[PDB]
């Protein structure tokens, strides 16, 4: 997958060691089909591809988080769009985390506080703010 050095992972994922939980991930659910299409895609991913996503993810926080500051609802145009923006970013970055799939991530993310703590490192409750943004976004699209 990532096949990076502790130093690259640091320059790329910051103070986050995903590799250590590589095989540990499947322990949680390890039953998805998407993950199969992703592994094929992440098979050769390099630090660049991985860093490209981080700088991209950082951007996601300021705007999302900034929305929170303004006190605007998550199902707001700006928020939901942000959600649709997240979708295409994580989808084209692994295989194509569809809308229905993108949602599965939203909530299954609130369950494990390990993700939250690592994700919320930017701000508490962000996970909830995104899920609703993604959920709503999926609704306006859903037939």
């Amino acid at each position: 997958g990532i096949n990076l050095t502790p130093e690259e992972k640091f320059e790329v994922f910051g103070d986050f060691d995903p590799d250590q939980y590589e095989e540990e991930v499947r322990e949680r659910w390890g039953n998805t089909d998407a993950y199969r299409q992703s592994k094929e895609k992440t098979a050769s991913y390099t630090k660049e591809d991985w860093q490209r996503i981080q700088d991209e993810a950082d951007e996601l926080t300021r705007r999302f988080v900034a929305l929170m500051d303004a006190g605007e609802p998550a199902d707001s145009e700006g928020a939901m769009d942000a959600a649709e923006d997240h979708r295409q970013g994580i989808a084209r970055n692994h295989y194509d985390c569809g809308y229905e799939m993108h949602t599965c991530l939203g909530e299954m993310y609130v369950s494990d506080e390990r993700f939250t703590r690592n994700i919320d490192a930017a701000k508490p409750g962000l996970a909830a703010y995104m899920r609703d943004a993604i959920l709503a976004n999926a609704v306006r699209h859903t037939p």
């Binding site: 039953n31 998805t32 993950y35 992703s38 692994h94």
Partner: peptide, 11 residues
């Protein structure tokens, strides 16, 4: 899907 710890997935 796609990782266990911040953002990709499978469900």
């Amino acid at each position: 899907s796609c990782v266990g710890x911040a953002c990709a997935x499978x469900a």
